[PDB]
Amino acid sequence: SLEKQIESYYQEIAQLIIDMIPEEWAEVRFYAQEDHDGWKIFFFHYLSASSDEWTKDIDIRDVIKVPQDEFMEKYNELSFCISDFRKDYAEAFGEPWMSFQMTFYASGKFNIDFYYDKNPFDTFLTRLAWQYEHFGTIPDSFYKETLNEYLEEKAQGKRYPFLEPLHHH
Amino acid sequence: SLEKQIESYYQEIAQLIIDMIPEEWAEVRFYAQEDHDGWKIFFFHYLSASSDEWTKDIDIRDVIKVPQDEFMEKYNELSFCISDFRKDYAEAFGEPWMSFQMTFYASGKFNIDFYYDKNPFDTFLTRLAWQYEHFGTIPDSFYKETLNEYLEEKAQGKRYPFLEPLHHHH
């Protein structure tokens, strides 16, 4: 079924991410983006089982045990899998996704949603904005100022659902 | 012309690598490989202008002062340029290259070659073997035993021109 084919892409992507993660994890959230011209942003964060803290993909290289080239191999594999999936999805659906967000849990539960908007922000600010939406993080004065570029767009009523998560006073 | 269009790619790849380099440099050597199924290895080393030592691309991240995402952005752009070039080259000439090597210098001079062989080695061993061939580097006991896999093939007279640098003196 089409549903089983999506589960297989999710499984393949999740396994490459799991291969990069150097410790027991509780939850992973993955953001991927590719436009018609091949411009790409992708990154994951994972919740460490031992510390119960969210950890960025880019921070794994500070604690890495395997040769860096082994991690980069998996990184390249994940990048190709994003693009290969986009192409097959476009052939089947008639148009590509522009981005997707995936969440998966230690339980084996997962969520995937697809979006079709252009993202005006670069890699660095996209991650700051994604973190802000997903975790409320408000982050260093230079980083804070950069996050403000996103916050000032939001303040004018602009919204970027592709990087947002899914009555007391 | 075809010559100008292909030199455009070489210039674009060189500029993305330059954008990743954090200091004055004298020379860069670049290796890229992609097969029919999208399997990819690519890396560069550069020769520092001040120290006159070679530095691996993967070691720049220890010294950069900008956000790691800015480096990863450039990495991603370079990776896409490799694949976009391969696809265009295959369309135009009717078959893709399997790998290529480029050398460029601060002067803007460059040398390049294309290869059509399959590489049997993974990312880690490919870089060790490439370093061995270009610089004579022999590594650490685990890294040395890994490189032995490659040296065992050389001992049988096998050769991998795609990772060798681009006369009867003693």
Q: How many residues does chain A have?
A: 169
Instruction: For chain A, positions 48-87, list CB contacts with chain B under 8 A.
Output: 58, 61, 67-70, 72-73, 76, 79-80, 83-84
DSSP labels, B82-105: HHHHHHHHHHHHSS--SEEEEEEE
- What is the spatial distance between Cα B85 and Cα B10, in angstroms, rounded to a whole number? 9
- What is the spatial distance between Cα B17 and Cα B46, in angstroms, rounded to a whole number? 9
Does one domain contain both A90 and A131? no
Determination technique used: X-ray
Does one domain contain both B94 and B131? no
Does one domain contain both B27 and B52? yes
Resolution (A): 1.6
Does one domain contain both B76 and B143? no
Domain boundary among B77, B100, B119: B119
The answer for residues whose C-beta is within 8 angstroms of residue B28's C-beta and 6 or more apart is B14, B17, B18, B21, B44, B45, B46, B47, B102, B103, B104, B105
Distance from CA of B156 to the nearest CA of A (A): 27
Structure token pair of residue A52: 């119960």
- Enclosing domain of residue A33: 1-119
Positive or negative: CA dihedral B164, B165, B167, B169: negative
- What is the spatial distance between Cα A129 and Cα A123, in angstroms, rounded to a whole number? 10
Instruction: For chain B, positions 9-38, list CB contacts with chain A under 8 A.
Output: 38
| DSSP β-bridge partners for residue A47 | A27, A54
User: Which DSSP state fits B118?
Assistant: P
Q: How many CB atoms lie within 10 A of CB B24?
A: 11
Q: What is the CATH number of the domain that holds A99?
A: 3.30.500.20
- What is the spatial distance between Cα B53 and Cα B116, in angstroms, rounded to a whole number? 31
